[PDB]
Every structure is written in C-alpha cells, then in structure tokens.
C-alpha cells in the first residue's frame, strides 16, 4: 500500500538530480561573435 | 508471490519494522518517523526507504528495453522481439 | 520563486547585475588571497609580536587604547586594510581622514620595528627548559569593570613555554571571561620582550649573569620553598570600583 | 540493438523528453548510486 | 538553549560544526602542513566553532573580527584571515540584516499538484483493450 | 532571459559540487550572453575569473586522467574529532601520551592550488590533430544522422559528456565575458 | 588510604621514577642550580599530599604560585602532568572554563535561484494504488 509513495518520492528526487545533466546542450546560441571585421581601432592600435 | 520485506542488514528487523508502521498512518513526515524508529537520521530513513525493492513484479528485451516509445510495426520488425 | 542570496536577499527585482552586496558596510574582501596565500604560507612560521595602542590623548579624540598581537614574519596583509576594517568595527564616522588611520599605521609599524622574537635564545641557543632568570611579572588589567593584580615568576630564558597556557589557567578564576586572557598573554610578551629586548641591547643572551639593573631584577636560587607574607605577593583578587581613567 | 534504440530515443526527443526509461528496478540504479544520498539531503533541508 | 531561526546560503551545505572539510584547507592550508607546532587543525576547529556560535548567538546583528581577538587569540593574522573567509562564506554575519515582501500571487503556487502531463519517471495513461482479458493470467 | 540578478554566483560555482557548478554555470552563461542592457560590471569581480580557470583546469585535468568528479565515497575529507583541547595543546605533554601510550597496552608538504599543467604522464605528446577547417564536414558526417549518431542530444546519461559539456559552456561563457573593457581584467 | 586510577599504582612519594626524569628532562641538566631533583621532589610531594588532604575537593594550580614562587611554567606543567596521571584531581566533575555559549543544532537553507527547490517540475499526482475491478 506505500509502493506508490516511494515511487513518487522518488520520480521527485529523480527529476531533480536528472536536471544537473542539463548545460544547455540542448540549444546552440550565438555568443557575440561580434568582431565581423576588427574595427580601424584595432589596425591603428597595432601600429601606435 | 510470497514476496518478503525482512530482507534488509545494518537495521534490525524492528528497525524497518517501526520504519514501515510510522510511514503507514504518519504521511512521510519524516521528523515524526525519524522520531518514530530508533535513532537513525530522518534521510537515512528517506534513503533505505527507498531502497526498498518490489522484487516480484519487473520481469525479464523490444519492451524491455523501451518504453514511452517503440519500432513501429507493419514490416518484419517482430525480428527485434525475437531478439 | 524565491529570494536568496546574500543576507535573505533579494531574487526577484528589475533583473539588473548587482556586484556583491554583502557589506555589512564596505564588507566583502576576498579578492586576491589565492595564489599569493598558498606560495607564502606553506613554509615555517616564527614568532610573534604584541602591540599596543594610544590615541585618545589630547592630541585626537579617540578610544584608541587596545591591544593585540602580530605575526612579523607575515606579508599578507595591508596593514593598512587591517586598521580600516578595525576601525569600521568600532562603529566609527566612516571620515576616516577625521579618524586618520596613517597615524595609526605608522604607530603600528613603529612598534614592530623594534622586534626579534625572543634572542638567540631561541635563534641559536636551546636551554633545556632556558636556564634562569625568572622575571617577577607583574600584570593588572582593568576589564569591564574590575581590575586584576598580580606578580610571579616567569621564566625570560626559557622557549618551551608559551604564555596562553597561563592564561587559560588562571581562567578557572570566577569565569576570567574571554577577553581578559588575551590581554594577559600580550602584556606577558609585552613583559617579556623589552627585558632581553634591552638585554639585547647588551650581550648575556648567551651567558649567565649580567648588566647593573638586571641585578635587582631577578629571582634568586630559592632553595627553599617561601614565607606567606612574601608570596602574599603572588595572589590575586577582584575588585569592583568607579573608574577615574 | 543499438539502431533499435536509437530509434526509439530519436522517436522520444523528437518529442518531449525524459531522463529515465526504466529504474523501476529500483535494486540497480540504488545500491549502484550514492548521489542519490547527497542529492536527498540538499532535498530535504527545503524540500 | 535555542531561541533564532537560523538561516544559510544552502551551497554552504557541506559546512559542519562537527567536521572539517577539503574545501577550507584548499582555502586557509596554513594549518595543515603541520610545521607550526602553534597551529593544528584542532585549534582551527576551536576557533571555528567559537566564532559560529557566537554569530548564530544573537545573529541580527554584526559580529566583528575585532571581538573575537578581544576574546581569545593566537595571533591576529591569521585571525581575521579566517574570520574574513567565512564571512565570504557567510557562515558568519550573514544575516545582519532583514529583508520583507508583501509576495502577491500568480497562477503557479506550492500548494499546486495536479494531473497533467510529466517529465518524471514512467506512467501509464492507457490500460488495456478487450482482448487482453483473453489470457490466462498469474 | 529574466529573473537571474546577482553577481555572487561566484561563491556557489568556488564550492565543489556538481549542483552548485551547474545551477551558477548555466545561469551565468545564459547571462553574459544578453547583452541588450547585460554587461559584467568590474567592482570585486576578479574571484569569478579566478574560481572559474580553477574548476576548468581540475576539470580538464582528470578528464585527461580519465576520472569522474562529484561523486566518491569519502567525504569531509579530512580530520574530524572533539579531542582533549580547549585551544592550546600539542606542547611538550604530547610526548607524555607516547609515555602514556607506552604504558596502556599492558610536517606534509602540501601542494598549491592547481595541479601540474605539462609533464602529465599518461599525457605523452603523440601528433594528433592538426587537420584544417575541412573537419566542418567530418563534424557533418559526425552530427549527421545515423543509427549510431551516439549525439545523446539529452543531459548526461553518462558523465562524460557531462564533462565534455562543462567544459563547453565554460569556454562559451568565457568568450562572452571578454568583449569591453575589463579586457585589463582579464589582461594577461 | 585512597584509591587512584589503577595503572597508576606505581607512585614513589619518596622517590623519583624514571618515568618522572623521562617525561620532564628539565630538572636533570644539572645546569640550572635554582632547580634539582631535591626542589622538585618537595614540589611534588607537596602538592600530592596537599591534594591529599581532601581530595574530595578539587585543587588548582595557581595554588601552588602562591605557595612556592617557583617557575610557573614548571609548576603548570608537572600540574597537567600529574592530571594527566590522575595522581592529583580524581575526585572531581568541575573547573571548566566559560564561552557563555553552548553548540546550538538548528538550521535553515535558501538559495533560490530556480535550479534548487526543485527544477520546478510539471504537477502530478497518484499517491495511493486502486483497483483493477477486472
């Protein structure tokens, strides 16, 4: 008669410990890759 | 059939015993059951508790080895069940 | 949901960045122990140093008249740091130009610049328990509301004893509450110190008797255990008082 | 085998997911795991 | 006696008054290279479990390094070294001050726990047809 | 997205367990990727940069030692006791329990912070890799789908990739840290 | 006349055990003329006896200070020592020293971001079994 208990209790804990697996894998977003070009500020700083 | 529940070491038989009558007419409050059984900390009994096997219904493939989802079936996939 | 992170906190607000609000006020060091601890701390450690502090004479308005203790052998610390955040524990006006901490700074380093633990004593020589010389220290401290008297022989040759011992000793007085003890040890090392510190300024750090005032500042043989008016010296007692300091 | 599974687990995220098809045997993921233990406790200060 | 309700920053949960752990030694190891006979992780703990009690005593207020070294002392450096890393740890004077909210309601609550569909461990949401009383069961 | 304040995540991600680096790991990077109104300020920052190399290096490392963290069977992992001391023993009555202990039966190094970088032995340089951008389609026929695409697309249902990701996120998260002023903060 | 800690029913209240020299190597330099074995022996034949006389009462240390004017690094010393060989204070449950303080045990966590407390997992339901009727 507790059986369903333990098993919810543990579907509970389960989930959570399942939800530490999760780094985003999941989606692939940009990560500013913003420099399309390097800017004048860049080739004017190498040569100052 | 004749599935046993004494089966348990490092816990007396008692132990899981007033385990098991504190979680029947107690609602897993575990402070009242840790208070309830004999000197063991309330998510030690949270952990043995669930360690508790129903060893007489999981039985030994296609099914099982999946669940939620299966091979569709109108070609020889039966083969798989054959496995 | 809900709101933790530094104090009871706040989780749910405008979604905005906020850098470590922690200070109970200007409260949060730990930048750059790291590296710079590990390196410096993994080898020996050496003596001590016990300071003194007086600002509250009438040429600045303080209760600057504390004492407490020091490694020399460290370099981990701006000192500076150590005093702000001494001073902000006061509970001071936080102008602390008006509670100028250089001055405070400079008396500590002042302080330290007349040190070298105890004398070959310790650098070079190692007497089996020291050798002689038992100073008859004399300590009162004035704490809460009670002042505490006494005077006792106390070994300056010897290493093998530190002063805490003592301290948590004569603890087992009525309660001898925490912040008495302290006190206690430093003035001891305080004592001590100045005594071979000015022997230092000699040269008996080695050998036996020195060279005109250690002469009456000393123990003698004692042969025999004393008398119980002389020792009536050793005792100590606890009395309560209005205070005129 | 193999194919057949990863058959049925592109089926699942294709789909909604879940993290585990099976551990009704509980004997296994339990006696051969202990993360579960300090994972619990986390649990249980808030729970 | 006990007379607070006491409250931590729950990443801290691997803190014990009883114990020590890896996690302090790779922060303050300049008690356990066992070469200042003065230091020992014993009178680490000491400390430790001084300065805690002290703070959870009365912690709606502020406890300062400056008291402890007023109290008992070995040195002062290291002192408020450690003093200072569990402050970072706010295991000390964490709660030195008190936060409050009126928290109106949304459609999601606690007390919330229906029928609806999971991502938990199996469940079964169809049974069986006719035909499958056809067997000749256990 | 929202919510998601603070900046102190820091002390969470220094500690060491697996939940604490993925609850801070996750949402930071989440984080540093806006940039609408989303910047890292610098006030005491500097202990997030720090924390952060610390974990990808011990990270990286037994991954090349080819060993989980997170989960053992020690714990608290060194000494525990309430032994005869109030604050001061360990003096010249140590030696009278050896006495003591003579009669009742009738130092360390320690290591720095991070572990070696180089000279690790089972790392022995053997050339590998170094192939050009062409493994953009080796990364095709790689994520290209097949019966043994082996892209457990979902969390780890195995460690390693658990690892693998880590690290991933990580690196990503770094990246986006570095594009303003505050590069001095991360200058060399 | 009054029973000790049993292994230390060895005591020479008029000699010197080797165990003694052993322990404290201090008084046996043969350096120092303000200590010897002689001045040591009447420190601790006096104190034992002393302790002796009502040993159904504790004795401290500070005691012999007043008592003596010898070193009291020496005397704290042979004073744990002797503790430590129950041949003084074994007769007593008391003198223990203050932090006004006792370890407290209760405790509360809360770090909410949203990984904690839960995932926040959809609801569910089912905590008893039912029938078949089949």
């Known amino acids: ?48 | 059939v004749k599935i046993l529940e004494q089966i348990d070491e490092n816990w007396s038989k008692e132990d899981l015993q007033k385990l098991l009558k504190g979680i029947q007419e107690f609602g897993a409050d575990w402070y009242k059951v840790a208070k309830n059984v004999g000197n063991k900390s309330p998510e030690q009994c949270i952990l043995r508790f669930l360690q508790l096997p129903i060893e007489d219904k999981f039985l030994y493939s296609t099914i099982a080895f999946l669940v939620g989802l299966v091979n569709p079936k109108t070609v020889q996939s039966m083969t798989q069940r054959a496995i | 949901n809900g709101y933790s992170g530094y104090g009871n906190g706040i989780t749910n607000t405008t979604t905005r960045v906020i850098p470590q609000v922690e200070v109970g006020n200007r409260k949060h060091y730990l930048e750059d122990k790291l590296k710079v601890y590990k390196q410096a701390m993994n080898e020996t450690s050496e003596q001590l140093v016990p300071i003194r502090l007086e600002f509250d004479q009438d040429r600045d308005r303080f209760f600057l008249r504390d004492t407490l203790l020091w490694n020399k052998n460290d370099k981990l610390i701006k000192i500076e740091d150590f005093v702000d955040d001494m001073l902000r524990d006061y509970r001071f006006e936080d102008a602390t130009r008006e509670q100028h901490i250089d001055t405070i700074c400079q008396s500590i380093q002042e302080q330290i610049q007349e040190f070298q633990g105890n004398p070959y004593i310790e650098l070079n020589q190692d007497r089996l328990g020291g050798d002689d010389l038992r100073i008859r220290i004399k300590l009162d401290i004035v704490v809460g509301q009670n002042q505490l008297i006494d005077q006792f022989e106390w070994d300056i040759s010897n290493s093998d004893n530190c002063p805490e011992e003592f301290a948590e000793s004569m603890c087992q007085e009525l309660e001898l509450p925490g912040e008495f003890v302290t006190a206690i040890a430093h003035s001891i090392r305080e004592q001590v110190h100045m005594y071979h510190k000015s022997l230092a300024l000699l040269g008996y750090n080695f050998d036996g008797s020195a060279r005109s005032r250690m002469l009456p500042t000393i123990t003698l043989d004692d042969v025999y255990r004393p008398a119980a008016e002389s020792k009536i010296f050793t005792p100590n007692l606890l009395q309560i008082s209005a205070a005129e300091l | 085998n193999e194919c057949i599974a990863s058959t049925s687990n592109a089926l699942k995220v294709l789909s909604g997911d879940e993290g585990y098809n099976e551990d009704m045997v509980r004997r296994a993921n339990f006696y051969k795991e202990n993360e579960a233990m300090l994972r619990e406790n986390i649990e249980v200060i808030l729970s | 006696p006990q007379a607070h309700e006491i409250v931590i920053p729950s990443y801290s949960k691997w803190f014990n008054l009883e114990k020590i752990h890896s996690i302090e030694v790779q922060s303050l190891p300049e008690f356990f290279t066992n070469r200042i006979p003065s230091k020992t992780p014993e009178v680490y703990m000491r400390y430790r479990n001084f300065m805690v009690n002290s703070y959870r005593l009365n912690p709606n207020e502020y406890f300062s390094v400056t008291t402890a070294r007023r109290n008992v002392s070995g040195d002062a450096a290291a002192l408020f070294r450690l003093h200072k890393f569990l402050t970072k740890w706010g295991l000390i004077n964490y709660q030195v001050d008190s936060k409050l909210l009126p928290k109106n309601i949304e459609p999601p609550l606690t007390s919330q726990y229906s029928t609806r569909h999971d991502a938990p461990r199996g469940l079964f949401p169809f049974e069986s047809y006719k035909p499958s009383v056809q067997l000749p069961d256990m | 997205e929202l919510g998601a304040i603070n900046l102190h995540a820091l002390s969470m991600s220094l500690q060491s367990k697996n939940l604490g680096e993925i609850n801070t790991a996750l949402n930071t990077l989440l984080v540093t990727s806006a940039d609408s109104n989303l910047k890292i300020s610098l006030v005491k920052y500097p202990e997030l940069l720090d924390s952060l190399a610390i974990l990808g290096m011990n990270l990286l490392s037994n991954l090349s030692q080819n060993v989980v963290p997170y989960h053992r069977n020690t714990s608290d992992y060194y000494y525990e006791d309430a032994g005869s001391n109030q604050y001061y023993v360990t003096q010249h009555d140590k030696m009278v329990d050896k006495i003591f202990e003579k009669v009742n039966n009738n130092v360390k190094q320690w290591d720095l912070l991070p572990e070696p970088i180089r000279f690790l032995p089972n790392q022995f340089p053997l050339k590998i890799h170094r192939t050009p951008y062409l493994t953009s389609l080796k990364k095709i026929k790689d994520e290209i789908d097949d019966p043994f695409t082996k892209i457990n697309t979902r969390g780890a249902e195995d460690p390693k990739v658990l690892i693998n990701d880590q690290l991933s996120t990580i690196s990503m998260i770094l990246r986006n840290i570095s594009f303003s002023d505050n590069n001095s903060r991360i200058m060399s």
Do not use: M
Request: glycine share 2%; hydrophobic share 40%.
């Open chain 1, 1 to 48: 008669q507790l059986l369903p208990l333990q098993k919810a209790v543990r579907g509970h804990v389960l989930q959570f410990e399942w939800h530490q697996n999760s780094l985003l894998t999941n989606t692939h977003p940009n990560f500013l890759s913003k420099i399309r070009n390097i800017n004048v500020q860049d080739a004017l700083l190498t040569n100052q």
